[PDB]
Design an enzyme around this catalytic site. Structure first.
Site, PDB file in Angstrom:
ATOM      1  N   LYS A   1     -10.300  18.298  39.420  1.00 62.40           N
ATOM      2  CA  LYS A   1      -9.338  18.465  40.508  1.00 62.40           C
ATOM      3  C   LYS A   1      -8.579  17.154  40.685  1.00 62.40           C
ATOM      4  CE  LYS A   1     -12.142  21.946  42.780  1.00 62.40           C
ATOM      5  NZ  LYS A   1     -11.308  23.150  43.045  1.00 62.40           N
TER       6      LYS A   1
ATOM      7  N   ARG B   1     -16.789  32.542  39.564  1.00 63.44           N
ATOM      8  CA  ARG B   1     -17.031  33.850  38.971  1.00 63.44           C
ATOM      9  C   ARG B   1     -18.133  33.813  37.921  1.00 63.44           C
ATOM     10  NH1 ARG B   1     -10.774  34.127  36.848  1.00 63.44           N
ATOM     11  NH2 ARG B   1     -10.477  32.406  38.329  1.00 63.44           N
TER      12      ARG B   1
END
Ligand SMILES: [Zn+2]
Ligand SMILES: [Zn+2]
Ligand SMILES: [Zn+2]
Ligand SMILES: [Zn+2]
Ligand SMILES: [Zn+2]
Ligand SMILES: [Zn+2]
Lengths: 518, 513, 517
Positions: free
Chosen positions: C300, C377
């Protein structure tokens, strides 16, 4: 003491040159009223022309050689002006039928040369020293300089003359030969004589710090840097103490230890002390930021302009403190007690690294919410300032390559100083004038303090509302100095010489002049 | 002059409120040593607690109402604390069964309040006034203030209380303001000085807050003429034909891409007696800064705020009101601003263009968004020709100030330490903070153009505030000159409004020098 | 309970949790309005509105049992105050017994029917009057018309915003909490069964907020699973924490790959509540439990990534644990609830998993990782395969999955996806009674082809569709083959950016869903 390695080819120590070619130069200062003897090597005249914008060159010193006096006549110098930095080489034979080399360096038309001007004058002198194989250089001062500027001329001459070749292997300079003697002819020579060996001491202290900064982070790590500081203290005979991880855990230095959590090198806290013979009337703690490499942590230096390849210099403040430790340990001032401190570590990316958002506890009990791992300098200094205040000193001066915002405020020339006490700041500015390392006073705006209020911790590490990071970082450091007069010098913009591709050694002369004048 | 329009719905003038409700407030100062009357309106006590951080509230003044006196007892006010900015106020009936409100505003635990602390205290007071219908406010000073700060209290209270609704389509304004403070007899004289300083700041804020379709070079100069006629100032507006013949090529190049012609504002205040000091105030007047072909497209450029690039000119016009109203002694003041608009068009000046200033210097344009110093250079050559003793320019020049001093302190540069010290002294008495920054001469070499006489911007030194000042210094040859960069302090980002910064600083500079 | 690993001895080894908050010490007493109000010590506040008239006058319509206070609150004195939503005023007077009392009001606007957001605005004004004042009792008079759910929501929100988390303060502190709360409302006997329900729902939200706000050096896979064991022990819930050796035997390659680069071993939380009467409903609740999301090698680093906030990437796990407290306390019957979370940390290391690596899920599906920051996920995929093997009727997962929710529904509404009418509709119905807003979003099957991997069975991310929230649901749908399943994306609503604090979103929504079956 033992440097960890990944492979057997990783270095285990920082190579340091103690006996440099400068230390072999015999320096002798002569009186200009008795005339100059030109004999051999290169003789350089520092010539000016007040009022005349790059006016003609005029040699105004009595030369004790008829042949060289005829060459230096006014009618022969139509063609050279005193433009700052201009230099010329002359070839001739003297009265003894010996070939000599004479020249000049233009010093402008401003009778008072600035610090930047004198550096430009010295650089022109070094260009004449390079690519030439001289045994003596002789400088004739036909300009006016005080005792500080004369010493500044010598230090800059010594510093720019030396070439650091510790890391060359198949590309050393084969045509590199240093002069062995330096003659100086100057007005009232006896008053400047005492500045010579002070300039040589100031030269190495600056050069020692430059050696440590220029050493890359694979050579210069927390262990090898503290090992070199011990070696320096033993050569000077100073008290020395290196605090390991287990001692820092007992002092609850949570902010300092959190920065170095992700490093393969253990944290090492440098504590050197110089104490006086006689009664002490000043206790000083000198703190230097010692980040041997700043990757930025998980706030990685990935944006354009971050210059991640230069972050080996994030320990420049520590190097300036250690360079001053040499100068103080050599010149031996007294009626003073000095503490040289540095919380050395490496800011790395790892599974053990500290994260943005983590809340850590400093050695004074304050909890800090980390907002940016690249703001690690103020975290390590916080524990170093608390440690320094426990020493019971009168002044605490920290020096750090803290914020890149310094580039956009003062640029690459002037350092910024912050503080909570006026006389200390004034003393820093006075030391800046006599050391000729320029520093400018910047404010600690208390209106920005509210933006450091954390919702959960006692204080925020960063603001992220105020874009004035150099001022905000001083707000943070102020929170860890409760009662002692304290000043903070931000050298992030001035430490590295981008044009010259080498460190400046900034701070060594400034801190020593501060120590020597109190 | 006539304001050009694209469509008939484009505005042709800046709406200006001279007649604010603040001017209807009767102000009364009374001595705290004699006790307070708390029988009408809303009474607010300014209380602190030295030593005890977040300590309890304790009112020490004798009030005349028995009911209000019972409310102010220590057993009832220890349930509140003095945290800086915290406030409480209650509604009750006085001894005569009349509706009154009593409360407090915490002043912290530091006896000496800064200008920022007083701003937070005033903000808490104003929040109570936007929810109040009583026609009287009484403020009781249980803290120590000189009235460089108490005038600042009145100035800031007046400014934050006023609300600009010129573009708009639960509160009434008070009719009386009572002040209980130590040494009230000395404290009378700053009341009407605060009202003059308030409007000069509010008038300047009105020009800044006016969007760029309302406030353009033509309408801004029209408002300056109107102001000079109400004040009785000498005024002169220079058009393009006259600006071309003074050879102000740098200024005219900035406005080529605009549909509005360049307009140079020149107001003059002259003394009735003899003139012992001539001062020229120069203001950057970019009514909108798109950046030109160096368009403000990067994140953070704040193109939507860029109507504020004339804040320096607004500060000069605001000072003209205060000077024109207080009419100082033995002084001649020139108010100058080279007003234009920086747009993108087929007629715009280009990156790389070489232009000639009115002093003959050729300039190599490196970035069209550095247009402020181009207009300031020609304004500085115009100012020096006036034969003045001091030239002070104020400009939203460089965004680098947001990374140096931030949004609180402005930076001042100059070639004369005596003028710089005079500006620093004016910062203390006007309470508009300014910090002195250096003109580093080592950076002068990076302005050396290969083809022109000088570069407009540097290509290496990433410190524009010093570089831009080095550029402007070349356009003041002999006069002592200073430059105030207010790019960071002009707009109040948290309050979504301008500050009117510089109006009181400039007025105190001319009124005390 | 496992031992928390440390780099230095100053590293924390447990998350601090406050179980006995000052809210639990407040004595709550509710009275009926048709009997008059008694203005007592402390502060008495009226909730007033004015339907139709925007910023209309204030009018107190309740009988006050004090002649003096009734004269103060007469219509000819309320007049100068209006009912604008969020306005508040304070009154000081003396009652019939010559005692000084404090009275006031908070305006509830017009509209008559107040939304959850509007009620929060009213409550925030109520908390401002409670703050910076040293009251021992607050009394609230309801002259606005509210149903049982909105009345409970008023108490839950008031308790939550009044509570102040100081667990990480040391040198910082300040002042106290009231000891009594009075409520006057029409038909009071019907509303007060909600009082102790609001106290239970409050702590579940605050407990989840405590876990979310806890930083990642405090709240890591080891310390987070230990807290779930500690919570299950106090509530007498069955619990099982799965270690790496057991997760290796279950072949959870997707979940294990995410935590490879962490110094904390992976811990799978499995809590269970069982009913006494025969079970006619089996439910599995899954929460995303990434204690810190560095993003992996897809670090990030972009400006908008908000990495300093990524301690909140376990907000889904905290919502399930908050539900475990509420369900474990109120004890509904005829239900088995399984509280699951695959907890780990996504870090950068020599041991981290790489972009492009192909990993195998516990159901045999091979996955090509296209972005390491899409780790949610991957951990959820193995958790859903584990959840379906339990033989439940409903599987509901809650996760701070995709930052795209900030660009679709924003910060107020969470998104729910699913494969079944009624699980979505039962969830949407639970949003109405819990007053936590959720919006139904589609699983567009046309995007499934963009997950076709050239080498693996399925791609982790799409290569063309920029609707990350919808693609993630398509990916998760591939791991629930036969059970009714729903997915709640709370990535945009979990953190209160303005207040710089968590919301505890999901606790009341998930609990209401369990209690209404
Ligand atoms: Zn850093
Ligand atoms: Zn650093
Ligand atoms: Zn511009
Ligand atoms: Zn501009
Ligand atoms: Zn992620
Ligand atoms: Zn995630």
């Amino acid at each position: 003491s033992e440097v960890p390695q990944v492979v057997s080819l990783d270095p285990t120590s920082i190579p340091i040159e103690y006996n440099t070619p400068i230390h072999d130069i015999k320096v002798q200062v002569y009186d200009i009223k008795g005339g100059c003897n030109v004999e051999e090597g290169l003789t350089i005249f520092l010539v000016n022309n007040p009022g005349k914008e790059n006016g003609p060159v005029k040699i105004s010193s009595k030369v004790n050689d008829k042949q060289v006096s005829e060459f230096l006549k006014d009618e022969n110098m139509e063609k050279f002006n005193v433009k700052l930095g201009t230099s010329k080489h002359f070839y001739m034979f003297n009265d003894n039928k010996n070939s000599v080399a004479v020249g000049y360096v233009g010093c402008g038309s401003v009778a008072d040369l600035s610090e930047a001007d004198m550096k430009r004058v010295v650089l022109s002198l070094v260009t004449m020293l390079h690519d030439n194989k001289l045994s003596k250089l002789t400088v004739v001062f036909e300009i006016n300089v005080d005792k500080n500027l004369f010493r500044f001329f010598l230090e800059t001459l010594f510093y720019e003359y030396m070439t650091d070749e510790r890391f060359k292997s198949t590309d050393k300079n084969v045509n590199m030969e240093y002069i062995k003697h330096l003659g100086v002819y100057i007005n009232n020579a006896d008053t400047y004589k005492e500045e010579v060996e002070k300039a040589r001491v100031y030269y190495f202290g600056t050069y020692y710090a430059s050696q440590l900064i220029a050493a890359p982070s694979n050579y210069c790590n927390p262990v090898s840097l503290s090992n070199a500081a011990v070696e320096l203290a033993q050569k000077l005979n100073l008290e020395y103490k290196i605090l390991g991880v287990k001692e820092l855990e007992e002092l609850k230095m949570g902010a300092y230890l959190s920065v170095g959590k992700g490093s393969m090198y253990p944290n090492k806290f440098i504590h050197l002390t110089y104490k006086s013979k006689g009664d002490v009337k000043k206790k000083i703690a000198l703190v230097g930021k010692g980040i041997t490499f700043d990757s930025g942590g998980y706030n990685l230096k990935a944006a354009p302009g971050s210059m991640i390849d230069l972050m080996k210099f994030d320990m420049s403040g520590c190097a300036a403190v250690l360079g001053c430790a040499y100068c103080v340990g050599t010149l031996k001032p007294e009626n003073v007690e000095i503490h040289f401190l540095s919380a050395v570590c490496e800011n790395m990316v790892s599974k053990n690294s500290y994260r943005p958002g983590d809340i850590i506890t400093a050695s004074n009990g304050k909890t800090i919410e980390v907002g940016n791992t690249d703001s690690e300098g103020r975290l390590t200094l916080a524990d170093a300032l608390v440690y320094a205040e426990k020493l019971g000193v009168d002044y605490i001066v920290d020096i750090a390559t803290l914020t890149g915002a310094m580039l956009y405020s003062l640029g690459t020339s002037y350092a910024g100083v912050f503080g909570n006490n006026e006389e200390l700041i004034n003393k820093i500015l006075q030391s800046s004038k006599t050391s000729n390392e320029p520093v400018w006073w910047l404010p600690i705006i208390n209106e920005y303090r509210a933006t450091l209020n954390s919702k959960y911790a006692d204080i925020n590490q960063i603001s992220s509302s105020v874009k004035a990071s150099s001022i905000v970082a001083s707000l943070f450091l102020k929170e860890f100095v409760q009662n002692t007069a304290w000043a903070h010098i931000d050298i992030a913009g001035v430490s590295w010489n981008f044009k010259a591709r080498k460190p400046k050694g900034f701070g060594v002369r400034l801190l020593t002049e501060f120590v020597l004048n109190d």
